[PDB]
Every structure is written in C-alpha cells, then in structure tokens.
Amino acid sequence: SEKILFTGLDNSGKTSIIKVLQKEISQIAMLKPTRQAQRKIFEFLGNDISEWDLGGQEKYRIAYLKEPTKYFDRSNVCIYVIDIQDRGRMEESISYFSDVIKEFRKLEISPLIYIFFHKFDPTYAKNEGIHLEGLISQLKDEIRNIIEEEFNVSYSNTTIYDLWSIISSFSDLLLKIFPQSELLDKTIQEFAESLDSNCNAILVLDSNSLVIGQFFENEESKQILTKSTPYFLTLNDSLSMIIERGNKRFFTDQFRIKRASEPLFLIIMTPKRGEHLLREKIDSFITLLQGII
Amino acid sequence: SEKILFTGLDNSGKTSIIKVLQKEISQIAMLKPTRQAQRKIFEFLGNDISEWDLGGQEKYRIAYLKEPTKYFDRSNVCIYVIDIQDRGRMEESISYFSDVIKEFRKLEISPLIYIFFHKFDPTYAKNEGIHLEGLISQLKDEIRNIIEEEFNVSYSNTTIYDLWSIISSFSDLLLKIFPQSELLDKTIQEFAESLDSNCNAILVLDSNSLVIGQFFENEESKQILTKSTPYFLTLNDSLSMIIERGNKRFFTDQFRIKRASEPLFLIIMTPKLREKIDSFITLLQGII
Amino acid sequence: SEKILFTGLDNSGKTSIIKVLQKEISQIAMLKPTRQAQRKIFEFLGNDISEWDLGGQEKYRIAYLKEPTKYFDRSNVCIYVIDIQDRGRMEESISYFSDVIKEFRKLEISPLIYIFFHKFDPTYAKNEGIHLEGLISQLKDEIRNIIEEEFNVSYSNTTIYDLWSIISSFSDLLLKIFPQSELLDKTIQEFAESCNAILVLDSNSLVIGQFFENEESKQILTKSTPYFLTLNDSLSMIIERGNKRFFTDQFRIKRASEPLFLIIMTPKLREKIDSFITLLQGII
Amino acid sequence: SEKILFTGLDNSGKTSIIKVLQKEISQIAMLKPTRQAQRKIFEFLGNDISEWDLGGQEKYRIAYLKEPTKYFDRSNVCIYVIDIQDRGRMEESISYFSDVIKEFRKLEISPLIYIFFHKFDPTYAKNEGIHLEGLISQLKDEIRNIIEEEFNVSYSNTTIYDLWSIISSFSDLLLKIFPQSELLDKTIQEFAESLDSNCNAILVLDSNSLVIGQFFENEESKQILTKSTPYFLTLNDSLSMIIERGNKRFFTDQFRIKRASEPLFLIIMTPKLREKIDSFITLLQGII
Amino acid sequence: SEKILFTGLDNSGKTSIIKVLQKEISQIAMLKPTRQAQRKIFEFLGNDISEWDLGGQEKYRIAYLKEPTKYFDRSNVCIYVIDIQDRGRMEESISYFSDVIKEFRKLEISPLIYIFFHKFDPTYAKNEGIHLEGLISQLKDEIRNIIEEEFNVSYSNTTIYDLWSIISSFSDLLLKIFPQSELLDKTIQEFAESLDSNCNAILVLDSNSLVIGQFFENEESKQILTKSTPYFLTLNDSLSMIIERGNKRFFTDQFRIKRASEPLFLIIMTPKLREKIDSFITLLQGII
Numbered sequence A: 001s002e003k004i005l006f007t008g009l010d011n012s013g014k015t016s017i018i019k020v021l022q023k024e025i026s027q028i029a030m031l032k033p034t035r036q037a038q039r040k041i042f043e044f045l046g047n048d049i050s051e052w053d054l055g056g057q058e059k060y061r062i063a064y065l066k067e068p069t070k071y072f073d074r075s076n077v078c079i080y081v082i083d084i085q086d087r088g089r090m091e092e093s094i095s096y097f098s099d100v101i102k103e104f105r106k107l108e109i110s111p112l113i114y115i116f117f118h119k120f121d122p123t124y125a126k127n128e129g130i131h132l133e134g135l136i137s138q139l140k141d142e143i144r145n146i147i148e149e150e151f152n153v154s155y156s157n158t159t160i161y162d163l164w165s166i167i168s169s170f171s172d173l174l175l176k177i178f179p180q181s182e183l184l185d186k187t188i189q190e191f192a193e194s195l196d197s198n199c200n201a202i203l204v205l206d207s208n209s210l211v212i213g214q215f216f217e218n219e220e221s222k223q224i225l226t227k228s229t230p231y232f233l234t235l236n237d238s239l240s241m242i243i244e245r246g247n248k249r250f251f252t253d254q255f256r257i258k259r260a261s262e263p264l265f266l267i268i269m270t271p272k273r274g275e276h277l278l279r280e281k282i283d284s285f286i287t288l289l290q291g292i293i
Numbered sequence B, D, E: 001s002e003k004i005l006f007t008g009l010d011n012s013g014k015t016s017i018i019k020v021l022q023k024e025i026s027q028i029a030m031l032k033p034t035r036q037a038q039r040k041i042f043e044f045l046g047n048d049i050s051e052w053d054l055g056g057q058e059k060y061r062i063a064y065l066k067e068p069t070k071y072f073d074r075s076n077v078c079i080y081v082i083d084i085q086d087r088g089r090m091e092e093s094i095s096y097f098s099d100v101i102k103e104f105r106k107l108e109i110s111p112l113i114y115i116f117f118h119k120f121d122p123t124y125a126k127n128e129g130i131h132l133e134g135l136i137s138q139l140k141d142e143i144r145n146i147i148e149e150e151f152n153v154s155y156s157n158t159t160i161y162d163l164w165s166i167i168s169s170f171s172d173l174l175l176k177i178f179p180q181s182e183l184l185d186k187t188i189q190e191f192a193e194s195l196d197s198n199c200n201a202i203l204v205l206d207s208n209s210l211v212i213g214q215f216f217e218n219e220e221s222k223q224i225l226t227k228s229t230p231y232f233l234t235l236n237d238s239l240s241m242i243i244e245r246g247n248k249r250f251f252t253d254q255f256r257i258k259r260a261s262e263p264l265f266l267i268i269m270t271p272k273l274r275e276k277i278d279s280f281i282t283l284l285q286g287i288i
Numbered sequence C: 001s002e003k004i005l006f007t008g009l010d011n012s013g014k015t016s017i018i019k020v021l022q023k024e025i026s027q028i029a030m031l032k033p034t035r036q037a038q039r040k041i042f043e044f045l046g047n048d049i050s051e052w053d054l055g056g057q058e059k060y061r062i063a064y065l066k067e068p069t070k071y072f073d074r075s076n077v078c079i080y081v082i083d084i085q086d087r088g089r090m091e092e093s094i095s096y097f098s099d100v101i102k103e104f105r106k107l108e109i110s111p112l113i114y115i116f117f118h119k120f121d122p123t124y125a126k127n128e129g130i131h132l133e134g135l136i137s138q139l140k141d142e143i144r145n146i147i148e149e150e151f152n153v154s155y156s157n158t159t160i161y162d163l164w165s166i167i168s169s170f171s172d173l174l175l176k177i178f179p180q181s182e183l184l185d186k187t188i189q190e191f192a193e194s195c196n197a198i199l200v201l202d203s204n205s206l207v208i209g210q211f212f213e214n215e216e217s218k219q220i221l222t223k224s225t226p227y228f229l230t231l232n233d234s235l236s237m238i239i240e241r242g243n244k245r246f247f248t249d250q251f252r253i254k255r256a257s258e259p260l261f262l263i264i265m266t267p268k269l270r271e272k273i274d275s276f277i278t279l280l281q282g283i284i
C-alpha cells in the first residue's frame, strides 16, 4: 500500500484539511486537538492508501520522536502543514520540521515532501500583500537548507476557504505517486479543441472528488468551474445531466474504469451561447479516458 | 401579528418539525428537550408571524396551565403534534390536548387547530399498516369529542423522513390564515394547459421554501418534482436555471412581488418558451 | 419589549456571534450568508427581547436603506460588528455605519451603540500586536466623528475562539438596558471576603454577577464553567480538580421563568451559601 | 492486525453505530448511504484494529459477493446489524446474512459472529413488548440454523438512544478478541468489597471510552454511573477529581499502562482514601 | 369429558364470574384470592364438564408454567378474563395470555379461546365512552397477533352487574363445544309466529339456568324477559306456572329430554294454548 503522513504543529490545520478532503466541512467547528495519530484507509484508482493524522501537541511530537519507527517509517509522502498566519510559531514549526527530516534520514527513507503553507485565506492574503510573500520565501529558504536536496519537495498555498487549493494539491501529490500518461492531457486538450472554441473547462474527478484530469481555457473559466463543481457534485450524489446556470452550460457524466471500485465524474463547461455538445463526442471522449486513466 | 403555537407532549417531535422548516435538519441529532417556550419571528408574503415552540415536559405543561394568558392567548393557529409511534403515551397526549382546548375556551378564542400525526415514517407506516390507520382513526374520534365542533380542525400525517409532508402541511396551514384568490389556481392550471402535453408539474415557492401554488399532472409527476426540488433549492441557494436529467427538463426562476421582502421561486417540470414563462410570472405578480 | 439589532458588513461574523450565544457552536461550520433579517425572541430576567440579525450582503443593505422604518425603527441597541482582520473593507464598513447612524437620526431615536471589534483572535492579536491597537484607535476616531455625541457608544473585542469575550460583552450590553442595584456587586464582593472567583449566570448562561480575585482565577473559572454547566444541564454539587474546589447551585427569582446558576471557586459552608442565595433573591 | 466488519442491509444503522463509538453523535443527522466499504484504524490496548463499514445498498452487496476475498477475508469479527423495527425486510436481511456466512465457509475462516438487533429504542421496545421479543426469538432460530454450530455467536439489543447498549456490546466484542485475565474481575470485586458498603459502581475505560472493567452493586447503581459517566468524561477531557451530586460521590482518575499509548480512565461511585485508590490502580497496571 | 379453563391475572374477576354462574352472587363479597386451581364438575345436556378456576397471583402463574401438562393439557376451552378497568395491568395481562397460548402450542392442542372483557359495568362503560372502546379494540389486535389464526377466538364484554352478559356468553361457549341442530332455531321461530303477534320472547334453559334456545321479537322484549327471568326461576325453585303483571303474561313449563338428568325450563312471554305448548315441547324433546 501507500502511506501518507500529515504532520506539523498543533493548530496548524491538519485535521481541517482532512475534513475538507472527506467532504465533512461541517465538522470543522466541532474540532478538538487530535490525540496522537488518527488513521484511515481510502482508495485511489484501485490502490489502497493509509492516511496518518499526527496530533501536533508537544506531548505528542515528543512521543513521535521517541518511537520513530512506529510513526514515520514506510512513509511515501509527508505533508507538513504550516500556519502562515502565525509568525510567532514559525521558528518552532521549522524546528519540528528539522526533527522530522532527521528521523527520515535515520530510517534511510526519502518520502515526497509536500509543504502546505496553510490558512492562506483570500482575505488574509489580500490584506498582507508582499509582506506575506516575503515570509513564505524565507520559509522556503529554511526548508531548502534543511532538505539539502536529499528529498523531493513541493510547495502549495492552501486554505479551507478555497476548496480547490486543498483538492488540487492533494491530487497533485497522489499523481506523483501514481504518474499518469502524457496521452491523458493530450487527449483532454484535443477533445476541447475538437469542440471549436466551445469549451471553457473540463474536470475529471474520482469518487473521492479528487482531480484526475483538468483543462482550463483561461483563469476566469478555471474559477467558475472549480467553484461551481462541488455544488454540482452534491446535486448529482443526492439525486448524465445538463445544467444551465448564468451564462454557462455544464455537462456531467459518470463512467467506470476497470481497476477502480467506484465511478469517475466528468464535467464539461461551455458558454451558454454555444452549441450543445453532441452525445457521440462525449462518448468517444469517455471511451478514451477509460483506456488511458 | 399572527401567532402560531407548537404544542404537544415532550418527545412528540415539535422542534424537529421546526428544524425541517428552518432548513436545519442537521441539528436534529443535537436536539435537547426544549426549555419552556422558544419563540421566533418569520415573514410570510409580507406578514410577520410569531412562532411559539412550547417544551412538552410535564413541569413546563403545568407552568403553561398555571399562567394561561401568557402562553395560549391571541393564538391564531395551534399545531398539536402527536407521536403516533408511541401508543402508550396517546392517552396522556389526548388528555393534555383537552387541557389546551379548555384554556382556549376560557379565553374565548377560536384558533385554527392543526393536528400533526407525526413520526409517520415510510418504514413505520409500511410495517404497521391498517393497525396504525385504525389507531389514527381512534385519535380523531377522541379529538372530535373534545372539540365538539367549536373549532376548525385540520389533520396531516408528518415525518422528518418526508420533507414534503411537513412543507405542504405547514403551507396549507398558512394559506388558511391568508387565503389566496381563486385566480391563482386558475392561472396555474391555464398556464399548464397552454403547454400542450408538455407540463408535468409546477411549484411556486416563497423564500422560506413554503408552497404558494402547485400543479401536478399525476401522482408520478408529483413524486418526481417534490422529491427533486429540495436538491435544486440547495443548489440554487449555494450558487434562472435549466436542468435536464433522465427524461425530464426543469426550469427554475425567481421573481418578486410588491408586498413581500424576498423573491419567490418558480420551478416547472416538462418532458424532455421564455415568453410563456415571463408572461406567466407577470400574471402571478398581479395575483399572488 | 426591547429590540437588539445586529448589523455590519457581510462576513463580519454577526451570525457566528449569535450562534455562540445560543450555545450552538457546532453549527458555525455550517453557516451561510444570512438572508435579510432573521429574528428571534428570548427572555432576560423576565423581560422579552427581540433580536434582529441583518444579513450584510450589499443587496440586503440597500433594502434596509430603502425601507428604514421596517428595519432600524424602535431599536434600543445597535450592535455593529467589524471584522478587524479585514482592513481592505474597513472604509466600506465605516461608510455603512455612517448610513445606519443617519437612519437613526432621521427616525429621531438614539439606541445604545455597541461596537464589536470581532475576529480579535488570540493568535491574530498576538502577531499583529500594537499595529492592531493603532487600527482600533483609527476606527474609534472615525466613529466619534460620525456619532457627534448624539449616541452612547461602547466598544468590545470579540472572537469565537474566546467564548467569554462574547458572553461578557453581550451580558454587559443587557445590563446597560436593565441596570442592576449597586447592592449586587457589594453583596458578591463581601461574600467572597467572608474565594478566588464567583459567577452568577441566568438560564441563557449570561453573566448577571461576577467576582475575580485575580486574572489567573478569572481564566480558570471562565474557561471551566461551560463544561460545569454542560455537566449540570445534561445531568447542588461540589467538584475538586487540581488545587481548586467548586460549588455549584441553582435558585429562582420571583420575576424570572427559569432558575439562575451560581458557581464559586475556592482554594481547596451550606449555611453561608444559603444566606448568600437568599440575599441574591432579594436584590437581582 | 485485527479486522472488524460491519455489514447488513442498507438503512439498518451500521454507520450510526460507528458514529456513536466515535463520539460524533451530532453527525448522525447528516448521514448519507455509505458507498462501498469505509475503513478506519484505531487502537485497543496497544493493538491496531481495522474497522470496515460495508455500505448495505444492493449494488454494493452484489460487489462484495462477487469479490469475497477483497471484503470478507481475514475478518476476526463480523457485526451483522438488523433493523428490528423493519419486519418487512427481515427475510431479505437473513438471506444476505446466509450469503455472508457462506462466504466465510468458502474462505475456511471462523470469525466471531455478533448480531446487533439495532434500533431497539426505549419507546419502540416499550410499545411492542412481547410482540417484538417473539420476533427476535424467531430471528435467533434462523441465525442458529444458518450457523449450524460452526461459528461463535453473540446477540445484543442496540439503539442510538441508549449509548451504553452500543458501548458495552462493542467492548464485549473486543474483549473476546483479546481475552482478559480472571484477576481483573476478582481485583475489581475485592476492591469494591474492601470499601465495605461504600462502593456502588466502578468503570475502567480506555481512551476510546470503551469498557475495560466494570462493577455494579445493583441495577440502579448501574443506571446512575453509566448515564453520568459520558458527561464526567466530557468534563475531564474538555478540561484526578471528586464530585458530589445528590446522595452520591464520584472519584475519577487517569492512569497509563505500559503497552498502550493513551491513559485509561477510572471512575468510582460511592454513597455519600487516596492510598487505597493508588494501590488499586497499581494492581490494574499489572493485570490489564 | 370436556375441560374448561378459567385463567387470567389475579383481580380480573374469574371466581366472581363463576359465582354468578353457580347462582351464588351472595358469596361475591366473601371472595378471597383463589389458591392455585379449584375444580368442579357440572353436567350440560348429558355431558360432564370439568371446570378449572386458576388462581391468578404471580406465584401461581409461575407454578402453572413450570408444570404445563398438569394444568393446560386437554383443555377444550380456555376462558381468559381481562379487567378492562385496569389499564395499568393490561401489559402484564397480555403478556401472561401470550404465555398460555405458547403452552397450548407446545402441547399441540387447539382449545377454543374465549376472551371475557370483564368489569364492563354499565356505569364504567357509560363514563368511559369510546375511549374504552378503542382500548378494547387495541386489546383485540394484540390477541389476534398472538393467535396468528391458529385458534378459534370469541369475545364478550362481561360484568357481574349484568347477569345476562355472563349467562349468554357462557351458554354461547358451551354451544360451540356442542353445536345444536338448525331445526332448533327454526322450531322456536315457527312456534313464535304460530301465535300471531301474541309472542314477544321465548327462553329455553337447562337446570343450570343456561340458555339452550332463545327468541326475541325486539330489544324491549329481550330486556323485559331477560331481567324478569332470574326472579321467575327463584320463585319456581323455591317452591307449570302463569304470571300476569303489567301488560305482559308469562308461561313457564318444565320438561325432560332423554339424555339429560334434570328437566329443562321453558318460559314464554306474551302480550296480555296448552295444546300448542305441549306440541312445541314435544318437538324440542326430539331436537335438543
């Protein structure tokens, strides 16, 4: 299987990120500090994945460093969550990150390192401007000096007030473990162009609502589709569909692949003024996706 | 202002019904016994209505009867909620119903009485069958002997597992307080027939999602629209729309009327013209 | 009957504050933008109080200013909520505050104005420090220029991450509407002298009386009382945890429907508590 | 590792039971039908245990039986949940239970079979009485004819309206996977007797609030401590202790054992000595 | 021989009903709780019948269910008596009834079940109204669910304040064991119409004063004769007769049938011929 480890200081936001990934946002208010490690198992495209949420209180971080084989071993990815709104605890956070990397070195493993600069809220980021960007740049410099190019590192700005920032970062991480064929993007890109200027955006999602494939004509089309899709997903699950809302038309479809348990979800967005997508075009597209993914 | 009173024994389901009406079903798992009377104010078509939820524990029921002018006076509608799954407490429920009716008599007021035979769940109703039907018929006989034709009494079977049963019963109650013109049903019927064989069902809702007008070509069209509308409303609120799914097409629209604060909601289901809709809405704005 | 009006821009936090007051914190994650005016009624010491939660989205603010008599009239207290983390919307917030004050002037009423500097979170205040205090000073100066000594104005810092900040501020507001006798504080002050802390709460868990020997005792009792309440309501009592001892009691007053709650924290006498309760029942 | 499997028909209540075990009762109102298998990992006295929640809708049960090695294999316990309020689906429930037992036989494994007669609510049980008792007796006969003494079977009446019904059954189930020494029951018994007539009830809980040991002088002392302890825990967790309410006094304590990660919880109820509690704790640390 | 079983909870009124049948109403005030089973033998139309009065206190009921073959075996009729004034013991009563039926199932016998809804006093029934009727209808449903159409069940409302209610129910019970020829009712009907409109009511009784045949022109004629007959019997016993009183005339006669030990009693009420009577007696002698 695969092991994904969430770690970081207490209050950094690890459990809230997980609650977003589980579509259980309503449980974020009732969140208490996580006690030791909480573990669950989920499936990504036919592969079972174990997820570890390490409670970040100091009494728990010490226990993690006392029995490192129990917690840090066999990790394929380490998600390290930093509360970028809490400058006063950043030095402490980098210090605990150095301890975690040191444990990986003693175990002689090199998991993918994914840093979530978390609580990067829209309101907070707008009011803080380049002052916040400079702080993140200093954080990366400290992280690079600790990593010393012995680990692969990725960085993402995340916030529970932007579901896409969490979904796409977690999807990008899973697709680094399970790389996709270049044919996938080439097929999606060619399908969009075969519609002749009548395709603003496409998403291919799995049963966890994680992103398997994507296309965006521009930044505005990306914002419209990624912000509307969760509500269309809620509608689909509660009830193929065609939805006209505002100046856009949405085509939604479910399809299965051989190796995965549950169906995948396809959504295509076009201008409302555009021609209706021919069903035979969507079906041939789905047939290729079933052979590529 | 109009006064609507929720009363009945504890555990009968009054607050859960209100939570359904407030679109807050998720809080039903968190419900505690209601402490005495809880009150809110909402608007229905430009009229304010105060809503009283009276906690049903015995210590509160005694307080209600000790100071009747503070709780039962000026009530325009009394909703009496009966847990029809609790046979063992029905005699106590009817007994307390007699007390409430007596206080109305002493105050010399005649509010509309609306019985909610509540917790009429689909699974429960299917397993209990004619026994539950006979048990409800016996409850009605006891209520009739208490009322003695001195009050207008309506009945409905309700359950939180059927949102339509609660929404349409409460809408029916409010439309008895505020009667509609006969032109409304005629306009909805005439608009439906003007679509040839291409109009299965219509719903006109207010901002509380209460039913102001309705049309159903048959029972199957009624089931499809009433079960699907709550999810379209959640989508519309979370974001004019058109939704095609299966063999049906759904048109949703919002329009305002002069006397009401928030817009109304129109949804039309057809098998799979903006002018017909715009002209329909214009007629509704002059009638509703 | 008294009318309390919650207003301010959308996203400022008004409904979350109300949810804390209703002991419904678990619903804050499920909150959506409030549509128009949501109204409820509750009792405070035998008095009925109507509470108005005005949705702050611009389309609703335009409707409030189009029909001022329907929303702002007969207001006894206006609670104006400002997201002090959102400097980018502060000019917009002060401008709408000016419009609200103007409607009060045209109605010729003078409600108590209670400003909540909301989202004053412990982490945010720790990191912003003195820069945030200067910002609050600028807001007070603007509000002063708008009020022009025609309204009584009070200020409070609030955050859903400090339940006491919201409970005490709202209690302080209600005690300005319904003033208490000075004998209440003196009776509590003298009972303790006869004690690290004392709270007298009503059935809404609002603060009717309080005593705190020092800042440390205050933090201990204020943070512990909700769970002592949760224990009580869900279930007199005597509790010992740590180096402290707690005494909880319930009693009724003549004009109130539900009982009041008394909790005393001492370092670790029935007759002295019963005489203290007797005096409270004759003063509150 | 150990594997616990929740299965049964859709709507039987499996996920609600798990929500109670996870101290997330507030989320029961938000539950949706479970899609295929949901899996979590928890610790019981130092042992990692995988928990499988198999969604019960028919399209999922067909998938389970198509690939029985992926779902039923290596199971230590099978919890089969039956909605005993839904007589109309009991024949369907027993038939799927027989299919599950058949898959265990083809795998040549013998998990403990634990039947939960769920939704045994206080109100429903009181109103149905002996009529429901006879129906449960008929269910046991069908289960026994399916088992044919090839499996170990346990039965429990459960309901989300009685938290102890679910906690104690799940605790009883875990203690059969990990049998305890007879010294634990004797030690708890002797300590309660060393207090003379000053010990009404004792509970020893783990960090999951599952029951490791228990003592009850009589049925009334059992109902007082079990219904009070969740609020004594929520107090302690959200915040040693002594509490006096009514005619009772309570002592709470936390202690750790060598092989477990988180502390255990001890609570003693007496009618209204620190050295005696410490020595009793020291004994438990060498026995558990 | 035939076996009739009187059973039911203590205080239900079993022994009081038997005292009415034995013409010993004066002993009702001296009744104590019956200790275990009391047994008598009486003759009905040439057939010996054993009558078991089972004491209903719980310690006796437990003794019955411990040795079911001694008490319940070979029963031809089980009379179950329910005090319908005591709602607080109806669950206990229905539960014990379920136990008795379970013993008949294990014995693989199917006696006639006769339910006496007892203490249906005129004053109590008048004051309780349809509330008592619903309760009896509820009890009837519980009995049906317990029986599952495996037994013949009859019902009657009985009370010691209406001798006819007890006499006619016990008579109807015995005639179900020993069905009569259809020529009997046709003969009584034909004799009545042969007297023109000069025949309001007829009773044919045995030496136990049980009703072998009856005829009533209307309800008033039934109430007059059924209420006057007990005193006519006492006069006849204490001493053929003719009695004129008010606007009615009563003819009484005694006759024997070949298979019965003691004479039968014929009473005819007419508005105010020996030969007609003698021939009517002759037909009855060969039909009964």
Ligand SMILES: Nc1nc2c(ncn2[C@@H]2O[C@H](COP(=O)(O)OP(=O)(O)OP(=O)(O)O)[C@@H](O)[C@H]2O)c(=O)[nH]1
Binding pocket: A008, A009, A010, A011, A012, A013, A014, A015, A016, A017, A028, A029, A031, A032, A033, A034, A035, A054, A055, A056, A057, A118, A119, A120, A121, A158, A159, A160, A161
């Ligand atoms: N503004 C903002 N707040 C957030 C965000 N994410 C989480 N929070 C809040 O931050 C607090 C910390 O959340 P948690 O998820 O419990 O943090 P944690 O890392 O799991 O803490 P531990 O359980 O001790 O490990 C919670 O009150 C969240 O509501 C975010 O993206 N933006």
Ligand SMILES: Nc1nc2c(ncn2[C@@H]2O[C@H](COP(=O)(O)OP(=O)(O)OP(=O)(O)O)[C@@H](O)[C@H]2O)c(=O)[nH]1
Binding pocket: B008, B009, B010, B011, B012, B013, B014, B015, B016, B017, B028, B029, B031, B032, B033, B034, B035, B054, B055, B056, B057, B118, B119, B120, B121, B158, B159, B160, B161
């Ligand atoms: N099966 C079923 N249960 C229901 C239904 N409605 C409410 N309940 C449950 O019945 C219980 C009673 O809920 P409440 O709404 O608090 O009852 P109440 O009348 O408000 O009781 P008081 O607050 O004491 O007056 C709750 O546990 C609900 O979940 C229903 O329609 N069907």
Ligand SMILES: Nc1nc2c(ncn2[C@@H]2O[C@H](COP(=O)(O)OP(=O)(O)OP(=O)(O)O)[C@@H](O)[C@H]2O)c(=O)[nH]1
Binding pocket: C008, C009, C010, C011, C012, C013, C014, C015, C016, C017, C028, C031, C032, C033, C034, C035, C054, C055, C056, C057, C118, C119, C120, C121, C158, C159, C160, C161
């Ligand atoms: N950090 C922080 N966030 C808060 C606080 N209070 C509320 N929020 C968040 O701010 C957002 C706005 O909350 P609301 O209470 O709905 O704001 P509102 O004033 O009611 O907005 P309208 O309904 O449009 O009038 C929500 O996401 C809350 O979670 C707080 O004290 N601190």
Ligand SMILES: Nc1nc2c(ncn2[C@@H]2O[C@H](COP(=O)(O)OP(=O)(O)OP(=O)(O)O)[C@@H](O)[C@H]2O)c(=O)[nH]1
Binding pocket: D009, D010, D011, D012, D013, D014, D015, D016, D017, D028, D031, D032, D033, D034, D035, D054, D055, D056, D057, D081, D118, D119, D120, D121, D158, D159, D160, D161
């Ligand atoms: N009255 C009563 N209702 C219950 C009880 N437990 C669960 N329910 C209700 O039963 C319904 C089914 O609950 P679930 O837990 O989702 O059932 P499930 O077995 O998980 O169904 P699937 O996800 O399809 O497998 C929900 O509406 C619950 O509220 C109970 O103990 N008593």
Ligand SMILES: Nc1nc2c(ncn2[C@@H]2O[C@H](COP(=O)(O)OP(=O)(O)OP(=O)(O)O)[C@@H](O)[C@H]2O)c(=O)[nH]1
Binding pocket: E008, E009, E010, E011, E012, E013, E014, E015, E016, E017, E028, E031, E032, E033, E034, E035, E054, E055, E056, E057, E118, E119, E120, E121, E158, E159, E160, E161
């Ligand atoms: N009002 C009223 N009381 C009755 C009636 N029949 C019996 N009772 C009273 O009910 C009480 C019970 O009478 P029993 O005949 O001794 O009852 P039982 O079933 O024989 O009791 P056990 O001997 O213990 O089995 C007596 O006090 C009677 O006076 C009736 O028809 N109406």
Ligand SMILES: [Mg+2]
Binding pocket: A014, A015, A016, A032, A033, A034, A053, A055, A056
């Ligand atoms: Mg956490």
Ligand SMILES: [Mg+2]
Binding pocket: B014, B015, B016, B032, B033, B034, B053, B055, B056
């Ligand atoms: Mg309630």
Ligand SMILES: [Mg+2]
Binding pocket: C014, C015, C016, C032, C033, C034, C053, C054, C055, C056
């Ligand atoms: Mg709001």
Ligand SMILES: [Mg+2]
Binding pocket: D014, D015, D016, D032, D033, D034, D055, D056
């Ligand atoms: Mg489920």
Ligand SMILES: [Mg+2]
Binding pocket: E014, E015, E016, E032, E033, E034, E053, E054, E055, E056
């Ligand atoms: Mg007797």
